[PDB]
Design an enzyme around this catalytic site. Sequence first.
Site, PDB file in Angstrom:
ATOM      1  CG  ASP A   1     -11.202  -6.914   0.546  1.00 54.95           C
ATOM      2  OD1 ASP A   1     -11.592  -6.204  -0.409  1.00 54.95           O
ATOM      3  OD2 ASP A   1     -10.390  -6.487   1.391  1.00 54.95           O
TER       4      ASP A   1
ATOM      5  NE  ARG B   1      -3.528   2.740   8.864  1.00 47.92           N
ATOM      6  CZ  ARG B   1      -4.402   2.609   7.868  1.00 47.92           C
ATOM      7  NH1 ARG B   1      -5.184   3.621   7.520  1.00 47.92           N
ATOM      8  NH2 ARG B   1      -4.487   1.460   7.210  1.00 47.92           N
TER       9      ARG B   1
ATOM     10  NE  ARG C   1      -8.562  -1.792  -0.443  1.00 50.34           N
ATOM     11  CZ  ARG C   1      -8.434  -0.825   0.459  1.00 50.34           C
ATOM     12  NH1 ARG C   1      -7.311  -0.727   1.158  1.00 50.34           N
ATOM     13  NH2 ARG C   1      -9.423   0.034   0.674  1.00 50.34           N
TER      14      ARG C   1
ATOM     15  N   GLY D   1     -14.920  -6.647  -5.661  1.00 55.78           N
ATOM     16  CA  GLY D   1     -14.461  -7.963  -5.252  1.00 55.78           C
ATOM     17  C   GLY D   1     -14.237  -8.138  -3.761  1.00 55.78           C
TER      18      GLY D   1
ATOM     19  CE1 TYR E   1      -5.390  -0.923   4.518  1.00 56.45           C
ATOM     20  CE2 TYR E   1      -3.242  -0.365   3.644  1.00 56.45           C
ATOM     21  CZ  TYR E   1      -4.609  -0.230   3.625  1.00 56.45           C
ATOM     22  OH  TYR E   1      -5.206   0.604   2.709  1.00 56.45           O
TER      23      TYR E   1
HETATM   24  C1  27V Z   1      -7.876   1.955  -2.370  1.00 56.89           C
HETATM   25  C2  27V Z   1      -6.505   1.954  -1.679  1.00 56.89           C
HETATM   26  C3  27V Z   1      -5.783   3.317  -1.628  1.00 56.89           C
HETATM   27  C4  27V Z   1      -5.967   4.054  -2.935  1.00 56.89           C
HETATM   28  C5  27V Z   1      -5.710   5.534  -2.727  1.00 56.89           C
HETATM   29  O1  27V Z   1      -6.205   4.158  -0.526  1.00 56.89           O
HETATM   30  C6  27V Z   1      -5.575   3.840   0.684  1.00 56.89           C
HETATM   31  C7  27V Z   1      -6.629   3.521   1.671  1.00 56.89           C
HETATM   32  C8  27V Z   1      -6.246   3.555   3.026  1.00 56.89           C
HETATM   33  C9  27V Z   1      -7.010   2.728   3.893  1.00 56.89           C
HETATM   34  O2  27V Z   1      -6.871   2.701   5.114  1.00 56.89           O
HETATM   35  O3  27V Z   1      -7.871   1.972   3.444  1.00 56.89           O
HETATM   36  C10 27V Z   1      -5.002   4.141   3.390  1.00 56.89           C
HETATM   37  C11 27V Z   1      -4.092   4.737   2.475  1.00 56.89           C
HETATM   38  S1  27V Z   1      -3.390   6.232   3.076  1.00 56.89           S
HETATM   39  C12 27V Z   1      -1.931   5.996   2.770  1.00 56.89           C
HETATM   40  N1  27V Z   1      -0.980   6.869   2.905  1.00 56.89           N
HETATM   41  N2  27V Z   1      -1.695   4.768   2.482  1.00 56.89           N
HETATM   42  C13 27V Z   1      -2.827   4.076   2.335  1.00 56.89           C
HETATM   43  O4  27V Z   1      -2.688   2.891   2.062  1.00 56.89           O
HETATM   44  C14 27V Z   1      -4.803   5.010   1.127  1.00 56.89           C
HETATM   45  N3  27V Z   1      -3.776   5.169   0.155  1.00 56.89           N
HETATM   46  C15 27V Z   1      -3.415   6.300  -0.320  1.00 56.89           C
HETATM   47  C16 27V Z   1      -2.316   6.267  -1.316  1.00 56.89           C
HETATM   48  O5  27V Z   1      -3.942   7.328   0.015  1.00 56.89           O
HETATM   49 CA    CA Z   2     -13.151  -5.160  -1.710  1.00 55.55          CA
END
Ligand code: 27V
Ligand code: CA
Lengths: 390, 390, 390, 390
Positions: free
Chosen positions: A242, A36, A211, A216, A322
């Site tokens: 967003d 990811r 973000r 928001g 993303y």
């Molecule tokens: C609110 C943004 C963060 C906060 C934990 O969560 C990420 C959300 C997410 C997504 O697809 O939306 C993927 C994740 S999973 C990951 N390893 N990286 C991400 O960005 C979530 N982040 C974390 C650190 O777990």
């Molecule tokens: Ca939002």
Amino acid sequence: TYMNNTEAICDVKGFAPFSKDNGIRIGSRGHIFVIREPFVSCSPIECRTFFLTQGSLLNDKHSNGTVKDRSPFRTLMSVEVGQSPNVYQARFEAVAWSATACHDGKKWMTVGVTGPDSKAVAVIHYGGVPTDVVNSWAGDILRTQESSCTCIQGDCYWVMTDGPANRQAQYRIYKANQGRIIGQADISFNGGHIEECSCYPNDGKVECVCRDNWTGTNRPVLVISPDLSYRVGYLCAGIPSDTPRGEDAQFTGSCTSPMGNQGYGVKGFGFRQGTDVWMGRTISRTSRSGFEILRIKNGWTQTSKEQIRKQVVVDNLNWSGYSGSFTLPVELSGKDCLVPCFWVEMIRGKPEEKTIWTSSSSIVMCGVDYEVADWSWHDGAILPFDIDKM
Amino acid sequence: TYMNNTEAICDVKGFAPFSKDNGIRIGSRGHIFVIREPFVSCSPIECRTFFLTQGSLLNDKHSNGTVKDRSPFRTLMSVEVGQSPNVYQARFEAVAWSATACHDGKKWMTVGVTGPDSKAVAVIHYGGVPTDVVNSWAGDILRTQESSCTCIQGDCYWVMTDGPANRQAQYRIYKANQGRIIGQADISFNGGHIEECSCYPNDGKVECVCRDNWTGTNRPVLVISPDLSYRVGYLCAGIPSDTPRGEDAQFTGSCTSPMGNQGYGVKGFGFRQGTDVWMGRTISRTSRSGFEILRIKNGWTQTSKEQIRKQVVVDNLNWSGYSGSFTLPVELSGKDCLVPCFWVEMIRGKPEEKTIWTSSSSIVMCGVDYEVADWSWHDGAILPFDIDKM
Amino acid sequence: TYMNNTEAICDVKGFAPFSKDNGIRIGSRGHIFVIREPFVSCSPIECRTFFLTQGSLLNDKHSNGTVKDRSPFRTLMSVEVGQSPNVYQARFEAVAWSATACHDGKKWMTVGVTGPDSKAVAVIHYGGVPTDVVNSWAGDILRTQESSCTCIQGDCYWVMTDGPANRQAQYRIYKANQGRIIGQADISFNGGHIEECSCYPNDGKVECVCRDNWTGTNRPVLVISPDLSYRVGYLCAGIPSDTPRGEDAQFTGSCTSPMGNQGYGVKGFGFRQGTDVWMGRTISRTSRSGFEILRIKNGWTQTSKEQIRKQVVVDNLNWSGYSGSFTLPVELSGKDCLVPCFWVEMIRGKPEEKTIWTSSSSIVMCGVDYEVADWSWHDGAILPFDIDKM
Amino acid sequence: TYMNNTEAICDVKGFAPFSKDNGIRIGSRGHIFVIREPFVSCSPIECRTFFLTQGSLLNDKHSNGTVKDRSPFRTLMSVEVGQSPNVYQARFEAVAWSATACHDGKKWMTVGVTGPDSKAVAVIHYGGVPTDVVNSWAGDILRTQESSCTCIQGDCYWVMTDGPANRQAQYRIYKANQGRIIGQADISFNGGHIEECSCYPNDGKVECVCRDNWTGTNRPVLVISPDLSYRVGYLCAGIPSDTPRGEDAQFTGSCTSPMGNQGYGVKGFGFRQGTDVWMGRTISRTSRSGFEILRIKNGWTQTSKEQIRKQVVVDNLNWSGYSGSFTLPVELSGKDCLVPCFWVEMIRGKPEEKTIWTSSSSIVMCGVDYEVADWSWHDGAILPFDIDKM
Ligand SMILES: CCC(CC)O[C@@H]1CC(C(=O)O)=C[C@]2(SC(=N)NC2=O)[C@H]1NC(C)=O
Ligand SMILES: [Ca+2]
Ligand SMILES: CCC(CC)O[C@@H]1CC(C(=O)O)=C[C@]2(SC(=N)NC2=O)[C@H]1NC(C)=O
Ligand SMILES: CCC(CC)O[C@@H]1CC(C(=O)O)=C[C@]2(SC(=N)NC2=O)[C@H]1NC(C)=O
Ligand SMILES: CCC(CC)O[C@@H]1CC(C(=O)O)=C[C@]2(SC(=N)NC2=O)[C@H]1NC(C)=O
Ligand SMILES: [Ca+2]
Ligand SMILES: [Ca+2]
Ligand SMILES: [Ca+2]
């Protein structure tokens, strides 16, 4: 030699394709990491794709992607941009279930965060070795950009968050040279929410579009000076970018506070263009699907609803995800400005698709002096996979 | 340092084998890209094989090759010549369903064309990054050489086409330095048709032998000066060298216009030798099968039917395909002239063979001072493949 | 800078293991080329393993090894010594169903022979490109060392054969600089037979121990001066070292002519040690099985039967094969002499083993100042393979 | 330039994660070597992971790991730290069923031991070639560190053992420059037992914490001066750190002799910190499971039972194994001291797990100026594998 990176961003009329990795199509038969959050940062020599690894391969049982995001098996690794995140071209970077990377002209500095949610640790690598550390200072899933950090005249800066993912959290700006922390700062932002910043250098400062995962549907904006004084608030533009979010007709702009009154979100980006802005967003208002980039005249400084350009890179029948920002260093482009560029992640698998896993590939676009036709460079792999019938 | 590339092409009596990649044989079990149109261009250090990728692998379902030529998954990548287009040695080049590559002595410049048929975009990379762009100027499948471009004293030149593939189209000459467009030109060629040029440097100009896909079974010829003034017309030789075409007995030469009154064609090449020419062509008059190269005394300047040499590299029981030209740079060969060389593509699969896919491998030959015996270095893989019984 | 390679060979009491590639064991699941005749030559930086490829992979149907030795799919490629001949580390060298390689201190020069039996062509590469050619001069399977060639002060030398493989043939010495032929010579050797020479530099000359495939169970020996004047004959030693051959008790030595009155043979090697010689040979008198190396006091200059040392590297319960010589360049070993070394090929599959294919791996040994214990570093893979039950 | 490596080790409050390779998870579908005993040593450029190979791959029949430890198929190879021991990134090092590696600032020196148990040979490579040899001097499984050796001002030192693995054996200190043995020494240590040393440089000497496989549950300690005078004995600390061993409550310290009166053991490590020590050990007293590292105030010089820190990197529900020490060279960390670091091996398969094979992956930790939270970066692969049901 340190990269100056003190130039202005180029004014761009549109975006041309840099690369597409086809990781998941290739992953049908090749050895590719499950990933990811890929992302690009560039040295004076090459732009690489960084990515989070699940310690596993596509079409393998360990692609059981129902085994945690913040697993102890997640590492940041990297390949040359365009190449796929395959094992045999992969260069190891850090242990990280959340990361950021950037180059200062001499070496690469990465930041890996691993450890438990209650007391996460961020390791700072530089030149291929650990050089400094940041512990969790708020006890709740310490984290950072998931996109390229920024370097200016030898000092690199990035943004970190520790706290709740859907309420008021804490937000910090770290600064470092040669892998060593030399200054930090708390961001006062009550009512606001900062996550997963996409930054770049512009006019000798770091501009960040991040973000809001609290309330928001517009994007928080951060402008950082070398002394770590800062301005912060929201992208003025009178158009929400967003996901999820509501219709454009039903939205009013703000420079100061969050708008739209919705939770969740997705990591995204934006590029200042004088007083205008290029803002990426999914085509769907409710789904991580499709991807477009809009220019808004005076969107950086006013509640403008003046759409002057619009380009599509992923059509709405396809999955997005993303997105983040980086710049072409002067030493590579040969320009007198900083060429703005972005990557877009294309998530396949769960939750939306019927398989046992989730990964993603990317395409990379780069700002040009010309209007570039809309198209769709979507992921393209056929789901489900072999191990999907197991 | 810029390559001069202002020398004359070597007079050659025949061709020796440089490399054979065995991609498809190797692709039976290894991880290899599905490809069409491989091609060679050389830096002062190495000659690489460039190729178009279908975003997929041999022996995998995504090798469904019934899913488009100009798909959004097509990328140009490259490996060292002789190596196979496998994932793990591949270096990413551009997003392209049609491409050209060349080196000016300092870095590589590629050109990727992707986007939709109605408004295609060509990205120009240099040193591993996008530097300039060419949009479709005629709205109809913008395209280019599918073989090595040419660099002389720092400026690189190549040929592009936008328009109908079987009628009068438009034909342009672009010129660039360090990845930046610095001059262009329209080619006046009414009644004529230019496609997929194979060029090389000769006497400080760019000589191109291309493809008439309208009415010509002889080959259009282009001679380009640094100032983008040009001569254009047809290879004088009184022997046809496109596919398809009729018998040699039934053909009359021309310097000026197309002959044979047949459509279609195949990408091919030719090398000036004073007033003579080396011309490659398939052995079959109707099939992309077999491959030979003929020397015609005064074939460059007269309607000559004087065959003085003849060498076979692919016997007629085997499949051929595209062919193109490149030169050995002086810095590598150690000669005082430009060594002429060619690659030949060997297409396996659909349409001729009974499988679900289509790919190709290559062999590379290089001009020598000696008569070299005929043989067949054919592709050699056994069809159909595993996924062929699926 | 050119390697001098004018030193004497080191006096050695035994041999230590350099590398073992495990290609075939690894080839059970990995992507490895089917090969015969691996061999080592060293640059001032690294020693690589060269090898002949069948255009195919282990555990794949194209490993149908009943499809020709001198097939049009055979290429020479190379990896760093110890690494296995896998696709993804392979560097392409030449089209060759018979080859030789060596380094002069600046670049690599290889020689690939391909083409048909009646008129074979040998291409000479240098720095990664074809530079000169040798045609078949006797119309009958032109061929050469299948082991490392030799370079002294910038000029490289090797031995070639054109003619019958079991009767009087013709034997030539070529010499080249920077990939360009600058001198050649016929070897007068009536009644004698020269094949597959293993050479090395010694005292500023090239010493070669080769193979008599006509009537000799002892080995022909060649000593070449820079001016291509030469001595030739047989290894004096009163002990036979080809395979097949008869018992040692039943054999008398010769300096001048072949002994043993037997046909066939196997490629082997030997190292002069003042007047003594180290001679490798299979343990079996009739089978390419086991491998040992004997020191014979005054074996280089007299009909000596004085065995002073004996070391085993492959026990007789295991399959051996080809063997050849190379030297450690001074720039790598740090010695004031030339360290003598050898590789031994370990053939698995047909004819002796019950499978559809034939390949081989190697081990590499290097002369030391100490007596080294006997052992067996045999190939070790388990036959038959997966595709063996197909 | 030679690395000085004469600095002091950094005082560290805890350990941060450097890398995790996920070899075995990745090995489910990728091509990975079966291995034991990975380990890290660093050049001024990169830290690599060295490892012992069984000549075979995960998920392949040759992973029959019931075919010997000291097999003739065992080679030392290496990849960049964090990368997995896959074939296609592997660099070949030596033939070895027991090894040690280190860098002196110019090149790498490895030491491979192979040959038979009764007369083993150790080859010393330097710059990629054999340079010197050590024969078995006691006739009984000659062996060495299985972890990084040490280099100070151009001279490298390591420890070797020849003799019984569970009684009085013989123990030697070798010293070399540029791959050449220049001094050796016998270690007088009656009643004591030295195995598999983990060493590092500290204050211009080599400190080693090793393994007593005879009667000691505490660890033997060695301090070596450039002149090969030495001190040897046991880690003073009043806490046992081998496996197996008894409870801490039931143990009394010693500087001089072994304690605990138990056999067996596991390779481990320790870092002097003035008079204190960091000692790694498995969490289990009886199983190679879990892994922790304790700081003991004055544990280097007194029978101290003063535990001042405690950090976990592998929780006790997971399998551990070998552990060893190395340092970050100054040229990479940018510190004025030597950063202490360790790797931990994670063994999966036989004996404890129900499969036909045994391999391992690693995680690497590095000393920081901060207390770092406990966690578990365990191996994580799911047993058994595909070939486990065959
Ligand atoms: C609110 C943004 C963060 C906060 C934990 O969560 C990420 C959300 C997410 C997504 O697809 O939306 C993927 C994740 S999973 C990951 N390893 N990286 C991400 O960005 C979530 N982040 C974390 C650190 O777990
Ligand atoms: Ca939002
Ligand atoms: C008339 C030549 C071009 C014009 C579209 O068509 C190419 C024909 C063709 C062939 O095998 O004959 C292969 C193609 S497919 C491709 N990606 N490259 C080719 O050269 C066709 N070119 C394009 C841009 O689609
Ligand atoms: C008499 C030696 C040569 C003469 C053709 O034949 C080689 C014999 C042989 C063997 O195992 O014994 C292997 C071969 S096959 C090959 N490609 N290389 C070899 O050395 C034979 N050589 C050739 C050029 O065909
Ligand atoms: C007592 C330590 C040595 C002495 C042979 O034995 C090693 C024990 C062992 C283990 O897991 O405990 C693994 C081994 S296997 C190996 N190749 N390396 C090891 O360290 C044993 N060492 C040798 C040289 O065989
Ligand atoms: Ca035509
Ligand atoms: Ca013989
Ligand atoms: Ca013990």
